[PDB]
Design a protein around this ligand. Structure first.
Ligand code: HDE
Ligand code: HDE
Ligand code: HDD
Ligand SMILES: [S]
Ligand SMILES: [S]
Ligand SMILES: [S]
Lengths: 726, 726, 308, 83
């Protein structure tokens, strides 16, 4: 038997912190985490222990190591059907990837409302705080393929499939409140501009190339979302620490048929956090799977991703009360003007069993709505409704994609549709048409009603001529970019400047860089000058004189647009690196781990080799990774305990670890003889805000460290890092 | 509520004769007919009654009569996702048809062996007389599309999917014991030659055209299966009344490892019966669904199709003891030399629910064997093994076609294959490879053994150079054609002559006709001269002196090759037309109907209109169809009861009914004044064999009629029909 | 006109060093380069300058900025076929990537033999030193997806399509002389083991995970190619500076019918060179397109990759 | 998309226009046309925006829909005049 004697091949079916166990399929890791959808998939789950290895036709295989041949050095025979079936299935494993958002990571969970929303919507899943709705959520980047890197600079997707009792509702959102373009007809133009360029298929996962900036320079409607992407919004720390948005005005419809305009929000209960550019970029090389891994391991540990669903609600008579159009998906609704009402909480608590069967084949589409919701004339949403059905015909192989297990509704579904490739449902209805007499007209239409009624569109009045024309009310491109800019902290502003500067420096055609700088001058002169300076461009006199755009309905900023202006940090689920030596002061480590456990903060013990070291009191300490195998990129903070510091004091890797963490603004804590390391990061004897240091790892030492971690990064350090060679 | 209040829209869920009730999905018509496979399909069967009409996403539809538009005369809106889902699924209903056997009709049933065959095969399905194996059987034609006609002249397919406890076994056979060609490399040439010609795509369902006979004329190996197709074998009365054959020598392997060569047979328990050409061809017009209909209604009536499985067995030592090579698929093994040993009985007792889901998507393949069976070097069989897996990749959309519910094994299946389009199974195995330690190597290989063992090929000796070479042993083309010809009755021989004559007359290039006639002269002079006469071709002195091919192992005929030389008739499930008049002698009809019912022979009451007529005694007789609506082509015999004959004496359709039935050799019975119709068909006063006549339908009238029906047709009438204008 | 007045949008159609000009499609950058195969693709090459924007049915589009709606703030209408054609084509742009070797970079070129090999083979492309054979060559990694990084540690593929006068000959090689396994029946097992693990689809472009090393530990036949992969062979500097091998014994067959066993080699005329691991790994982050970019810029510079 | 295997059905020979066709659509299964255009999007400067939109006009102009007036509520309703 091949498994080890000691059983150490199988991970414990109990929550465990990151790195403590091998990761596993969700039904094996957490067999007792259930919801109606996870239970309904049981008909298709297939186990393996104690079963014979067979063909797909149920024939037991005796020898799965050899082909059939004429003599043991002879040719392979065509009658080897076991070989051909095995190689045939392999040869056909791949299906097309998503046109956009091909890179994504997914998990099962549940949603439950905080109260009944029947006053504003008849959506059944929102009708009672007792209604638990299973969900399957997929987070994604946009540009890169399914095998591209996670921590790229990109917009992120945030798609939630609600398995309601009245149908699938898919809320297919992103991590910013707007989009780059106004009309769906231009989606292929924008996406081709951002994607790798067609001659040579470069670059992967990056907007940092001529065609994207060419389009942006020619299409100023893009500038608002571009501001978001160039901010640290474009490089989230974790899918758990980003906001989500429904992108468009939708409608809620109540039992009396009153329509309310709505935009959707997801608020991360773990707070808002992002990386810094150098750290993100480097992370794409050290671990291109960082966000996929971090999501999976958060769920395995019990650090379930939690989000509060939020609605901004605008009465139908208020349609024209703002100085932007509610239907323009390049415009956000400032929360200072229309606050977000907190409506329910979603918790992701189980990973899938098979990534390809559940994640890669999942089909989300924003036209999948239920009674109680409805669309608006947003010209981007309008065209989306065509695309998300049509694309599945090639991607998932035909019109029966709703029969693929993950996609199936848990609500009943019956109708007169038949056949199509890989038809699973065997219909017994004598009729495949209605009206019919031969089955007494079943399944039958249902009138719209307050509950369990059929779907009827809100009877919006439509008046105008058939035209291909952009609404004049959409023709304003700079005021929202400016509101966003003015709402960021001074360090968030610096990072926006750096992001534009870095991307534009990668644009080979200089006139494109010049044209983008001219657009920036229409938004904010200080921004435009700082970018221009980094590109060796000088603003002309006309550019210095462009009048700024107006404020947004009297607003000159909204702190809700900042990641960091209002404190929101949560340390539970973060990770610290602890750099060991060959004789650690055990009293430091006891206290460190103690205080980290009490706040739910994880640890990785790192050294110059694998195996174990032994502490001063004989405690054996297992090593998780080397300094080079688990770089500071992958942690939120670094602690160096006392002991034999001579062992690591002249380790290039150990020194670099602290330099890299220092450069990336992370909290560093140093006890006793670890303060010798201050010299590698140029810290004055008197100390520095963001460096914790004491004789030992006592109680106050860990409090100060955990305080820094709640504030995410040490922004005050930014002017010191320019001089550090890391 | 659109159903009639009287409930007459719904067929009784009990066995009912053809025409008595509308036909229905099998699980509704016969809910209590069950087997392991039918039970296992329950997870995918979808009902309808009492359910709301929904989208595929489970959203209830309020108005399934209208698109969403701006105004009730305005344009349709792109946001109508209900319309687009419904039309999308429609737009993609069709999948590629099978390259050959696209036209086919299928049913569920079960198989049981008469005794354990463990002394000659370890095949689990043949191990125990109390072991019942569900089956799904599809019968087919070969050339025409899925929408071609049933009663064409063609070979028929007879494919049986056995859902065994040790895997799927597919016995993929035909209704003749040989094939047209020797080597699978030629299969596209052959199929292309018989299929509609590529410039214009004509003719459908017919080998009567230049390219087929061109190929035959240049490939004498084809002549044996051509003899079969030109005989009345090419035009079966019913899939219940044709033989089935497995085509190739395969092997049985027992527990001790002994190989026995085997050819497979199905014997129809309902007897062998075929149409005549003029009837079959006219029937493709009057009811191109006649065999599909007959099968489905046989099963609804309880006349279940039954077949006996039989094996011709040849010991390994006797491989070379025949004049022909056992591996040559153009040669049959005469039953006089090697008898068929009875093995077991198959009964087809339930129709599918949905023809597309179960019939159109079923995948049969002769490589699907189980332990206890193996292949041989037959070079046609060898290439088949490649084709039947490959073709499913387009036909059924990918490598997961075994997950299409009809195709699923009932035996367990587990392995390390993953992904592919339409993936249903969600594997929870930590490992997707072996050898693996992380799942203790499960699922595991299994050694071969006497029961429940892994598959191991029989260790046949291979010795030879790599060559593209036909065996010299296959180079004999005429002896088997001749054996077949000499085994046929004189009426069968006549129908063979007429088949070749009719077909060659559709061959536009006369040299191809001439070349075929030359080949016939190498088989048998009488055959060649009679076809030649019909084509206005005179044999040369050289052709007249071709010496005939040798006997086959001393055989000069084998009566088992004839449909009719040894009587095997069974009237149960046959049908009689009864030509009504507006004042029928009720005592004749009581005698007629009860005599038919007692032998399980069905009846269809015909008249000049629909509705009712009233017998002499006031009995109200319901009319099934008009004379023109249900022509004599669709019945096995015709009875005319006495009464008011003048009502129909002058009806052209009634007279033509008798003329047509007369020409096609069918028994006809005339009671009382119905004898006035003797003048229509030219019968002498004193009567003739094959015409039943008497004062009344009592006494021996019905027995004589049933005796005629047992012998199927009135072959002795053949010289009389020669000059009938019908 | 959106192009700048000084024409600085168009790359010089002449050899220029990496970084000097934007990169361009081959037939635009190097219009004077030709071979029989490049010539034969002319019938499907589609230009653009001075043409009207159309549907795929050849209908000129007037407004390619907006959908058709009922008033300028109204719903999009189902009759907008120009919109649905454009979005349909976009919706179906992707095809399945290769099961293995999904990530790869390709260029046209030509091959010529130094002398007739008619004494050992009757292969026409090797019969005459004046016979020039067009090629198309794709280099690749093995494990990662089409959107994975170039400077991973992995085996590399080196596949050459020879368009010969007697048929296509594809020499489908790798940059090491052997493979991990002996029998093809085990290929899905091995590939599954090295590919991202099936529960979570991690890691991309890497053999550094449990299932790969489980398989190796249980199948010592793999050790030979694993040594190669763990060596600096696993991290080439450039596709121009790695060896190519045909992996198997094939046969040459001469006019007389004599068979000679052959194994195929490609020698890089630019020499052999590899990165070091810390560099290779950081480079997958700094420029995951490095080898694709380097190949394309070498050819645009006239640093043509050459192999014997 | 299913019948003819994807969105490049206009490249199947019988279906090809004899009029010129040039646009920014790319890829899809069994793609025949090899596009040389540096650009696959518009507006672009890198190919001076070609191929370009064409105003409607008397001949050789771009397609523009007739500006029919639309007035009504979003309804799934059969016109009474059809009954
Ligand atoms: C012996 C009975 C018999 C023989 C000798 C052949 N067919 Fe059949 N056939 C396919 C290919 C194929 C080849 C390559 C050869 C000789 C090389 C034969 N045939 C001769 C196929 C293209 O793979 C086929 C079409 C679609 C499919 O799935 O398989 C196929 C069909 C077929 C059927 C129909 C089974 C069913 O789907 O109902 C039958 C009964 C035969 N063949 C018998 C057969
Ligand atoms: C010796 C060089 C070599 C070896 C030993 C193998 N590959 Fe390759 N491969 C495919 C299958 C396959 C099998 C079955 C085996 C041993 C049994 C090998 N490989 C080992 C494939 C799945 O059919 C493949 C994927 C898509 C495709 O069309 O073929 C495939 C790819 C591949 C390439 C990429 C070709 C390209 O498009 O650039 C190369 C260079 C190899 N294999 C080399 C190779
Ligand atoms: C008209 C085309 C179009 C437009 C304008 C948009 N989308 Fe989209 N989207 C698609 C057409 C599409 C798509 C091509 O249909 C995708 C890729 C394949 C898929 O299944 O749907 C998709 C996928 C996709 C996904 C990934 C779903 C998954 O994880 O499987 C997300 C999160 C979004 N989109 C979100 C957005 C947002 C937030 C948009 C602007 C607010 C947006 N899309 C505009
Ligand atoms: S959006
Ligand atoms: S056969
Ligand atoms: S190889």
């Amino acid at each position: 038997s091949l498994a080890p004697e000691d059983g150490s091949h199988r991970p414990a079916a109990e929550p465990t912190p990151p790195g403590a166990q091998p990761t596993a399929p969700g039904s094996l890791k957490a067999p007792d985490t259930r919801n109606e959808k996870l239970n309904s998939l049981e008909d298709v789950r297939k186990g393996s222990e104690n079963y014979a290895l067979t063909t797909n036709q149920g024939v037991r295989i005796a020898d799965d190591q050899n082909s059939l041949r004429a003599g043991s050095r002879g040719p392979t025979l065509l009658e080897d059907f076991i070989l051909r079936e095995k190689i045939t299935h392999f040869d056909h494993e791949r299906i097309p990837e998503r046109i956009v958002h091909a890179r994504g990571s997914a998990a099962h969970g549940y949603f439950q409302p905080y109260k009944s929303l029947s006053d504003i919507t008849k959506a059944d899943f929102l009708s009672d705080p007792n209604k638990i709705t299973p969900v399957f959520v997929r987070f994604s980047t946009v540009q890169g393929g399914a095998g591209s890197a996670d921590t790229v600079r990109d917009i992120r997707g945030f798609a939630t499939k609600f398995y309601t009792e009245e149908g699938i509702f898919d809320l297919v959102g992103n991590n910013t409140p707007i989009f780059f373009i106004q009309d769906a007809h231009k989606f292929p133009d924008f996406v081709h501009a951002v994607k790798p360029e067609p001659h040579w298929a470069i670059p992967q996962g990056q907007s940092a190339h001529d065609t994207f900036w060419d389009y942006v320079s020619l299409q100023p409607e893009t500038l608002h979302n571009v501001m978001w992407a160039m901010s640290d919004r474009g490089i989230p720390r974790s899918y758990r620490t980003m906001e989500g948005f429904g992108c468009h005005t939708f409608r809620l419809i109540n039992a009396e048929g009153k329509a309310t305009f709505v935009r959707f929000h997801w608020k991360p209960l773990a707070g808002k956090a992002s990386l810094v550019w150098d750290e993100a970029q480097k992370l794409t090389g050290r671990d291109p799977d960082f966000h996929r891994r971090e999501l999976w391991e958060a769920i395995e540990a019990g650090d379930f991703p939690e989000y509060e669903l939020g609605f901004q609600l605008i009465p139908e008579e208020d349609e024209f009360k703002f100085d932007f159009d509610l239907l323009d998906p390049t415009k956000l609704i400032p929360e200072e003007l229309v606050p977000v009402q907190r409506v329910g909480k979603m918790v992701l608590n189980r990973n899938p069993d098979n990534f390809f069967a559940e994640n890669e084949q999942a089909a989300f589409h924003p036209g999948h709505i239920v009674p109680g919701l409805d669309f608006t004339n947003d010209p981007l949403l309008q065209g989306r409704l065509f695309s998300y059905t049509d694309t599945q015909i090639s991607r998932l192989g035909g019109p029966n994609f709703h029969e693929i297990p993950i996609n199936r509704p848990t609500a009943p579904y019956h109708n007169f549709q038949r056949d199509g490739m890989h038809r699973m449902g065997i219909d017994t209805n004598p009729a495949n048409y209605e009206p019919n007499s031969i089955n007494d007209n079943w399944p039958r239409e249902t009138p719209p009603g307050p509950k369990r009624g059929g779907f009827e569109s809100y009877q919006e009045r439509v008046e105008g001529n058939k035209v291909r024309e952009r609404s004049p009310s959409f023709g304003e491109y700079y005021s929202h970019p400016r509101l966003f800019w003015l709402s960021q902290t001074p360090f968030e502003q610096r990072h926006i400047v750096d992001g534009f500067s870095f991307e534009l420096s990668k644009v080979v055609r200089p006139y494109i860089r010049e044209r983008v700088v001219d657009q920036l001058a229409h938004i904010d002169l200080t921004l435009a000058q700082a970018v221009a300076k980094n590109l060796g461009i000088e603003l002309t006199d006309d550019q210095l004189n462009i009048t700024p755009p107006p404020d947004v309905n009297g607003l000159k900023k909204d702190p809700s647009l900042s990641l960091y202006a209002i404190p929101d940090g949560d340390v539970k689920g973060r990770v610290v690196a602890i750099l060991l030596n060959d004789e650690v002061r055990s009293a430091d480590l006891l206290a460190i781990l103690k205080a980290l456990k009490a706040k739910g903060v994880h640890a990785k013990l790192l050294y110059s080799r694998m195996g174990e070291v032994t502490a001063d009191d004989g405690t054996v300490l297992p090593i998780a990774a080397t300094f080079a195998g688990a770089p500071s990129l992958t942690v939120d903070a670094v602690i160096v305990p006392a002991g034999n510091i001579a062992d690591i004091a002249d380790n290039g890797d150990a020194n670099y670890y602290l330099m890299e963490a220092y450069k990336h603004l992370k909290p560093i804590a140093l006890a006793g003889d670890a303060r010798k390391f201050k010299a590698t990061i140029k810290i004055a004897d008197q100390g520095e805000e963001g460096i914790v240091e004491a004789d030992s790892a006592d109680g106050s030492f860990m409090d100060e460290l955990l305080t820094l971690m709640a504030a995410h990064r040490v922004w005050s350090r930014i002017p010191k890092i320019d001089k550090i060679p890391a």
